[PDB]
């Protein structure tokens, strides 16, 4: 009973020290787990959502909401640990262009989620506000037959959840472009809206 939605309390500074209850180190210890356990939890996720949903579209939106609830957490944790606690620190850039948060994703997010850095990151020549984020080998979903793409939305559900909470609202879809020796390649394309673009249209 400290902060309700009803009032504000007034208590004096330099009073007595209160009790010590719960604390934890924010910086990561290096922890590893097998790929099989997270793959088993991932297929159990897709199995339960296959069980309790009717058609493909709202299944995809529910999986994207599942990814969203990791991404909105993950933004502040990765930026605070890239600016690293009680140790004396200096905060980061807090980047605000479009072309460097995608650089931040392709550099730090994919090398945080996985051992390897993300592969390629190109724009679209035919239209602006379309950005291609591509890998060669999806390590979330390498265990499903390749003709289904909807099970690939969870990771781009992260990316929308990484982007909308960072101040750039957008929308993502994913397709599979079988280019080269990689049969599954998994393009994720990011559709922004107009109302952000003219904002950076206003900023020269």
């Amino acid at each position: 009973t400290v902060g309700p939605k009803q009032a504000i309390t007034s208590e004096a500074s330099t009073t007595y020290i209160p009790s010590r209850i719960y604390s934890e180190s924010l910086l990561f210890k290096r922890q590893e787990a097998s790929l099989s356990a997270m793959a088993f939890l991932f297929q159990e996720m897709i199995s339960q959502l296959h069980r309790t949903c009717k058609t493909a579209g709202d299944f995809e939106t529910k999986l994207s909401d599942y990814g969203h609830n990791i991404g909105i957490r993950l933004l502040e944790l990765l930026n605070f640990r890239a600016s690293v606690s009680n140790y004396i620190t200096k905060m980061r850039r807090r980047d605000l262009k479009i072309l460097d948060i995608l650089q931040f994703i392709h550099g730090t997010l994919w090398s945080y989620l996985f051992n390897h850095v993300s592969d390629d990151l190109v724009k679209s020549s035919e239209r602006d506000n379309e950005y291609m984020i591509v890998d060669n080998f999806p390590t979330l979903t390498q265990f499903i037959p390749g003709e289904n793409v909807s099970c690939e939305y969870f990771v781009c559900g992260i990316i929308k959840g990484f982007l909308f909470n960072a101040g750039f609202p957008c929308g993502v879809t994913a397709h599979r472009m079988p280019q080269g020796g990689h049969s599954q390649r998994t393009v994720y394309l990011i559709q922004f809206d107009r109302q952000v673009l003219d904002r950076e249209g206003l900023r020269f």
Partner: peptide, 24 residues
């Protein structure tokens, strides 16, 4: 402290931070 609050999976955003430990 706010990052320590946000890492709770039960705590979603647009919720008041109703914790006395945070006050302390």
């Amino acid at each position: 402290l706010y990052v320590k609050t946000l890492m709770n999976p039960f705590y979603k955003i647009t919720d008041p931070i109703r914790s006395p430990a945070f006050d302390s």
